[PDB]
Amino acid sequence: AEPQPPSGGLTDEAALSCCSDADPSTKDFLLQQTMLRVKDPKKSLDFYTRVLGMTLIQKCDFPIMKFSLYFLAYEDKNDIPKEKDEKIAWALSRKATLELTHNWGTEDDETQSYHNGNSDPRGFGHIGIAVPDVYSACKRFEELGVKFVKKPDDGKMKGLAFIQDPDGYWIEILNPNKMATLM
Amino acid sequence: AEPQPPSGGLTDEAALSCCSDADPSTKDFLLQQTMLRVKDPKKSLDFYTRVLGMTLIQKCDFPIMKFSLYFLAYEDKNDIPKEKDEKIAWALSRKATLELTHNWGTEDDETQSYHNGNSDPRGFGHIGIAVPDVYSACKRFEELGVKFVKKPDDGKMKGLAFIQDPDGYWIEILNPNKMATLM
Numbered sequence: 001a002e003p004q005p006p007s008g009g010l011t012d013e014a015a016l017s018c019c020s021d022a023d024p025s026t027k028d029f030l031l032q033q034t035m036l037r038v039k040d041p042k043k044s045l046d047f048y049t050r051v052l053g054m055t056l057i058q059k060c061d062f063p064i065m066k067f068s069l070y071f072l073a074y075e076d077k078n079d080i081p082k083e084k085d086e087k088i089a090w091a092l093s094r095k096a097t098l099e100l101t102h103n104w105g106t107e108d109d110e111t112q113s114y115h116n117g118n119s120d121p122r123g124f125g126h127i128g129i130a131v132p133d134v135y136s137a138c139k140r141f142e143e144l145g146v147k148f149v150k151k152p153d154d155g156k157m158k159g160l161a162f163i164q165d166p167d168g169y170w171i172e173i174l175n176p177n178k179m180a181t182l183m
Numbered sequence: 184a185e186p187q188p189p190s191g192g193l194t195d196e197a198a199l200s201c202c203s204d205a206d207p208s209t210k211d212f213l214l215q216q217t218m219l220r221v222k223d224p225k226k227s228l229d230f231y232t233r234v235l236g237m238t239l240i241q242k243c244d245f246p247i248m249k250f251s252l253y254f255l256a257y258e259d260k261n262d263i264p265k266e267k268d269e270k271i272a273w274a275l276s277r278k279a280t281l282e283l284t285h286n287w288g289t290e291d292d293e294t295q296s297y298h299n300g301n302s303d304p305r306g307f308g309h310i311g312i313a314v315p316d317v318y319s320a321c322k323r324f325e326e327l328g329v330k331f332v333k334k335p336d337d338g339k340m341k342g343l344a345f346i347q348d349p350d351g352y353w354i355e356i357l358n359p360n361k362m363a364t365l366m
């Protein structure tokens with residue numbers, strides 16, 4: 001009922017009082033995809049497959065509306081079913097996929113670019129890739145012409161990097177075993 | 184090369200010639216996180232845990248810079264290590280996590296809202312949750328006061344839904360076994 005002084009962040013206890021246990025109706029839900037719009041799928045496919053080691057697991061074309069969907073994931077290309085319906089059902093039940101939306105023609109348009117969400121207006125910030133070694137990964141990214149937002153040892157938090165994809169989306173490069181030393 | 188008629192997107196063959204096999208240096212890379220900025224973590228935690236059945240697996244507070252990070256995932260809460268360093272290392276090596284960024288004070292600012300990327304300027308579009316039954320999941324979402332962008336049987340592609348979270352970010356609700364029927 002009383003006005004309170006500026007809280008600050010939530011306490012661990014406040015955050016937890018806002019959390020409910022998983023209802024049994026949600027028990028088989030999984031976080032399947034993140035969708036990003038890409039100007040030029042040729043550049044995006046080369047980046048995500050060659051630079052980041054992802055596999056293209058499904059491509060969907062919509063001839064009438066004139067757009068394509070590309071699903072990228074860290075999956076063994078030998079696990080991709082060969083039959084069309086089984087393939088789509090396997091691809092779209094993989095956890096942690098990246099869905100790239102290509103609105104046909106944007107690749108031919110000098111002015112068009114997508115917004116990465118890290119300048120006004122902000123919202124989405126980044127995807128993040130966990131790697132065994134941020135320094136070796138980033139050395140290879142440098143050699144392959146990758147643009148950096150943050151080199152691993154530049155700024156406050158060392159051993160953490162941000163690169164950008166061909167559309168300028170930020171990608172965090174993190175070692176899960178080194179994040180405790182920043183927290 | 185000669186000037187071409189308007190883009191028909193890539194052929195399956197063109198898309199494949201833009202893909203490289205995974206370099207051995209990337210072999211342990213995994214798509215770990217998607218980061219979204221949230222105005223009010225009380226509302227976002229309630230939505231992602233109670234409505235969507237995700238588990239809060241890690242909370243990080245930065246008292247001096249004045250922001251919190253919340254990591255949400257489809258994980259069994261009994262798998263969360265209890266000790267701080269082992270917990271962070273386990274949380275930040277989970278596939279398919281959602282990272283919510285709370286810039287302290289945004290919850291106390293009448294005017295402030297984040298941009299969902301689905302109006303100018305566009306980029307990020309959505310996350311997507313794979314569910315065993317889109318219609319039962321959506322019936323429950325309706326009963327829980329969830330705002331819809333697309334009801335499963337509205338629009339051209341039926342059996343697919345979009346809801347929005349408390350910040351207005353779009354969330355696709357999909358059955359992997361029904362997506363082949365939309366191609």
Ligand SMILES: COc1ccc(/C=C(\CC(=O)O)c2nc3ccccc3s2)cc1
Pocket residue numbers: 149150155157160162172179180182183218243252271275282
């Ligand atoms: C663009 O520059 C930066 C530099 C550091 C960060 C810090 C991050 C990444 C993020 O905020 O998403 C950190 N994340 C974690 C997660 C766990 C433990 C410590 C950190 S610091 C973010 C952006």
Ligand SMILES: COc1ccc(/C=C(\CC(=O)O)c2nc3ccccc3s2)cc1
Pocket residue numbers: 035060069088092099332333338340343345355362363365366
């Ligand atoms: C906002 O309204 C819609 C309605 C349908 C769609 C269609 C989608 C979702 C998307 O574009 O990410 C489809 N995704 C797939 C994936 C595989 C096969 C078919 C489809 S249709 C998108 C937005």
Ligand SMILES: [Zn+2]
Pocket residue numbers: 033035099309311355
């Ligand atoms: Zn989607």
Ligand SMILES: [Zn+2]
Pocket residue numbers: 126128172216218282
């Ligand atoms: Zn992050």
